[PDB]
Design a protein around this ligand. Structure first.
Ligand SMILES: CC(C)(COP(=O)(O)OP(=O)(O)OC[C@H]1O[C@@H](n2cnc3c(N)ncnc32)[C@H](O)[C@@H]1OP(=O)(O)O)[C@@H](O)C(=O)NCCC(=O)NCCS
Ligand SMILES: CC(C)(COP(=O)(O)OP(=O)(O)OC[C@H]1O[C@@H](n2cnc3c(N)ncnc32)[C@H](O)[C@@H]1OP(=O)(O)O)[C@@H](O)C(=O)NCCC(=O)NCCS
Lengths: 387, 387
C-alpha cells in the first residue's frame, strides 16, 4: 500500500534540463561610459578621486555592457534611489514586484516554446529572485501571467543571493526525480533596481556592486524520463552539494533595509573562492574517478573577473575553460542567480552551432558553481548530451 | 553509470517525521485583557468604537493567550512600531533577524534531542519564516548556532505566509525520498514583531491580524528508511498538493514595506476556504478510496476560528475532529507557518498520552492543510504510526 504508492509515484532517470530561455530589460548600458553616467546621475561629479577609482573598476570588470530596468528617466523621478543611503524601499519594491515576474515571464515563454509541450504539463514552479519580496509572491504572479494550472506546486525562493543559480538546480533535481511525470519550470529573475545606490568613498565594497551587477531572467524546464524524440535533453544533473567556506564570515552580506538592499564585502571573496574550490571539486569528482579539471566543461558564477582569474590560476585551467562564463560576463555583467543559467545557454548553443559532439563543449562531464553569501559554494555535477 | 549512480543515490520508503520540538518567546500575553493593553500601548484609547470592535474580535477569537517577542518595554522604545503606519522596517528587521534563528534554535535542539542521532547526520535544512529577510539568511545563522556540518544543504524559505507549514512538509518529502540517508531538519520560526502595528478604523482587516497572530517555532527531523528501534517514526507523508482557489485574488495579501509587513484581507477567507476544501479533499483521498472525512485525522491551519467553523459546518465533521487544532489556537494563537507543526505535536502527544492505537488519534490516514496568500491551499496526506 504505501510502498506501492511510493513505487508508482517516483520517476526513474536523472533530472534533465530540457529547455532554456532568457530575457533582459531593453535598456542597454555601455560599461565604458558608465562611470560618467553613474557619477553624474548620482550628483557625485565633485568626487574626483572616487570617480577615478570607479573608472578603474569598470575598465577592469571585463564587462562590456549590462541590461538595466533602471533608466535615467526612472532615476530622475527617484532621487532617493540615487543617494547612497536614503529611504527608498517602497519605491524599489514597486519597481521589482512588477519587473521580476514580467521579465521572468518573457524568459519562461521562450523556454516553454523550445520545450514544445503543453504548459498544463508543468507540475512544479520554482521562482528565484534576490530583488524584492511580496505576498502572494512572484511565483503566484508568474502562474497567473503564464496561464499555468492553479495546482502547479510552487517554490518561492526570495532573497537568496548570487549562488542561487546552483540552488534552483539542486532543488529542481529532487523535484523532477522523485515525481513521475513532473516537469519543473525554473525561473531566475534578477533586477538591480533594489540595489542601485549612489557612491560613497568609505563604502567601496558597495561601489564594486555598482560596477558589476546587471539584470536578467532565465527559465528552464527540468524533468526526468524525457519522451524520446519529443523532448530533447540538453544537460543531465547527477549530483549536487552546497557548502560554507571556512573563515568567510561576512564575505558577502546583503541586508534589505528601508534604504533598499545593501551589499558589504568584508573578506577576500576571490581568495576565499580560489582556496576552497579544489575541495568542492574533489568532493564532486573523486567518486567519478576524475581528477583532471581541464577534462570537464565548466560553468562558474562570474561574481566579477577576479574570482574567475584566481580560480583559473589556482587549478591551472586552460584559458578556454572559462570562455562561456566570460562571454556571459562580457555581455550581461553578473546577473546574480540567473547568471549561471545564461552560461548553460551560452555553452550549449555554441557547442551545437560549432558542430561539437556534446552540448558540454564536446566533453562528457561538467561542473556548475554558484558563489554567494555565507561564503556559500553551490556545486552541481552535470553530464552533457550527445549532439 | 548515471542510472547506477541514480539507483544508489535514492532512498526507498516514504518520508517520515521522526521528531518534533517547539519553542515560543517567554512573554505570555493574555487575550482577555489584550484590547486594553493594545489600545493603551498604541495611544489609541480615545478610539472607543474601534476598541469595542477589537474586544469583540479578541473575545470571538477562541484564543486564550499568545507568546510574543514584543514586550511593553520593547514597544515603549519603538513608537514607530506602535503607530499604524510609520517608517520602522530597520527596527523590526533588527528584532527578527536575531529572534527568528534564536527561537528556531530552541525548537531544533529539542527535536534533535528527541531524535537522538548525531547532529552531523543532518544532511538538509529547511528554514521557513514570514518575518524578516537577511543575507546570509536564517538558514545560515541556524547552521552556525546549532553546529551543523558546513555542507548541510540549505533551503531558505522567506516571506511565504500562513500556508507554509504545508510547503515545508511538501519540500521535506522530496528531499528525504530522493536521497539515501538524508535526514532533514525543518525549522519554521515566526515572530510577529514585523507585523505588529497600531489600529486604524479604516483598516479593520489589519486589526484582525492584531487579534490573531502569535509567535513560535517548530522543528522536525524528516527522513526515509528509519533505522528500526533506533529512530521512531511519528507520521508518514504519502502525498501532497498545492493549489490556488478560484475567485480569491487578493484574499490574503502581505507587503513588506518601510513601515513593516502589512496584511490586507480583500475577500471572504473563511468562505473561500470552506467552498474549496471539498475539492482538495477529493483530489487527496479519492485515490485512497476514502470519502468519509470523519474517518481520517485532521490538521488545519487555524487562520482564526471562522475558517475552522465554516470548514466543519461545510463537511459535517464531528466537533472533535478539530480538537488538536483548536487546542493549539487556544494556547498560542495563529503562529503562521509553525502553527500546523505544533498541531502535529499536540495530536501525537495526546494520542500517546491517552493510550490510543496510533499517533493519528487511533486512525490510520490523516490530512494536513495550510491556508494563506494566493488564496493558496497546501494539502499533505499523512499516515499515522502504530502506537
Ligand atoms: C572589482 C574588479 C572588477 C577589479 O578588477 P581588478 O583586476 O581586481 O583590478 P584592480 O586590482 O586594479 O582594482 C580595482 C579597484 O577595486 C577596489 N576594491 C575592490 N575590493 C575592495 C575592497 N575590499 N576595499 C577597497 N577597495 C576595493 C580597489 O580600491 C581598486 O581601485 P584602485 O585602482 O584605486 O586601486 C575585481 O576586483 C573583482 O572582480 N572584484 C570582485 C570580487 C567580488 O567579491 N565580487 C563579489 C560580488 S558582491
Ligand atoms: C475575527 C474572528 C476571530 C471573529 O469571530 P467571529 O465569529 O467571526 O465574530 P463576529 O462575526 O461577531 O465579528 C468580529 C469582528 O470582525 C470584524 N471583521 C472581520 N473581517 C472584517 C472585514 N473584512 N471587514 C470589516 N470588519 C471585519 C467585524 O467588523 C466584527 O466586529 P463587530 O462586532 O463590529 O461587528 C473571525 O472573524 C475570524 O476567524 N476571522 C478570520 C478570517 C481570516 O481571514 N483570517 C486570515 C488571517 S490574515
Amino acid at each position: 500500500s504505501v510502498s506501492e504508492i511510493r513505487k508508482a509515484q517516483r520517476a526513474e532517470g536523472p533530472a534533465t534540463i530540457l529547455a532554456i530561455g532568457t530575457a533582459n530589460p531593453a535598456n542597454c548600458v555601455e560599461q565604458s561610459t558608465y562611470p560618467d553616467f553613474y557619477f553624474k546621475i548620482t550628483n557625485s561629479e565633485h568626487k574626483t578621486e572616487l570617480k577615478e577609482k570607479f573608472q578603474r573598476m569598470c575598465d577592469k570588470s571585463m564587462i562590456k555592457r549590462r541590461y538595466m530596468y533602471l533608466t535615467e528617466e526612472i532615476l530622475k523621478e527617484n532621487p532617493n534611489v540615487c543617494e547612497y543611503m536614503a529611504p527608498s524601499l517602497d519605491a524599489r519594491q514597486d519597481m521589482v514586484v512588477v519587473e521580476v515576474p514580467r521579465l521572468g515571464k518573457e524568459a519562461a515563454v521562450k523556454a516553454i516554446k523550445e520545450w514544445g509541450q503543453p504548459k498544463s504539463k508543468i507540475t512544479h514552479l520554482i521562482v528565484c529572485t534576490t530583488s524584492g519580496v511580496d505576498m502572494p509572491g512572484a511565483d503566484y504572479q508568474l502562474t497567473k501571467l503564464l496561464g499555468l494550472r492553479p495546482y502547479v506546486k510552487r517554490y518561492m525562493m526570495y532573497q537568496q543571493g548570487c549562488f542561487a543559480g546552483g540552488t534552483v538546480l539542486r532543488l529542481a533535481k529532487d523535484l523532477a526525480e522523485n515525481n513521475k511525470g513532473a516537469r519543473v519550470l525554473v525561473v531566475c529573475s534578477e533586477v538591480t533596481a533594489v540595489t542601485f545606490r549612489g557612491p560613497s568613498d568609505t563604502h567601496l565594497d558597495s561601489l564594486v556592486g555598482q560596477a558589476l551587477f546587471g539584470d536578467g531572467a532565465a527559465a528552464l524546464i527540468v524533468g526526468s524520463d524525457p519522451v524520446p524524440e519529443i523532448e530533447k535533453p540538453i544537460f543531465e544533473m547527477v549530483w549536487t552539494a552546497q557548502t560554507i567556506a571556512p573563515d568567510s564570515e561576512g564575505a558577502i552580506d546583503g541586508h534589505l533595509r528601508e534604504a533598499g538592499l545593501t551589499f558589504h564585502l568584508l573578506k577576500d571573496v576571490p581568495g576565499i573562492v580560489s582556496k576552497n574550490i579544489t575541495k568542492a571539486l574533489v568532493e564532486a569528482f573523486e567518486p567519478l574517478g576524475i581528477s583532471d579539471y581541464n577534462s570537464i566543461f565548466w560553468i562558474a558564477h562570474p561574481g566579477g573577473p577576479a574570482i574567475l582569474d584566481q580560480v583559473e590560476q589556482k587549478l591551472a585551467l586552460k584559458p578556454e575553460k572559462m570562455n562561456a562564463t566570460r562571454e556571459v560576463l562580457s555581455e550581461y555583467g553578473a546577473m546574480s542567480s540567473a547568471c549561471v543559467l545564461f552560461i548553460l545557454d551560452e555553452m550549449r548553443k555554441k557547442s551545437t552551432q560549432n558542430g561539437l559532439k556534446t552540448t558540454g563543449e564536446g566533453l562528457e562531464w561538467g561542473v556548475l558553481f554558484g558563489f554567494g553569501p555565507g561564503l556559500t559554494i553551490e556545486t552541481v555535477v552535470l553530464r552533457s548530451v550527445a549532439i
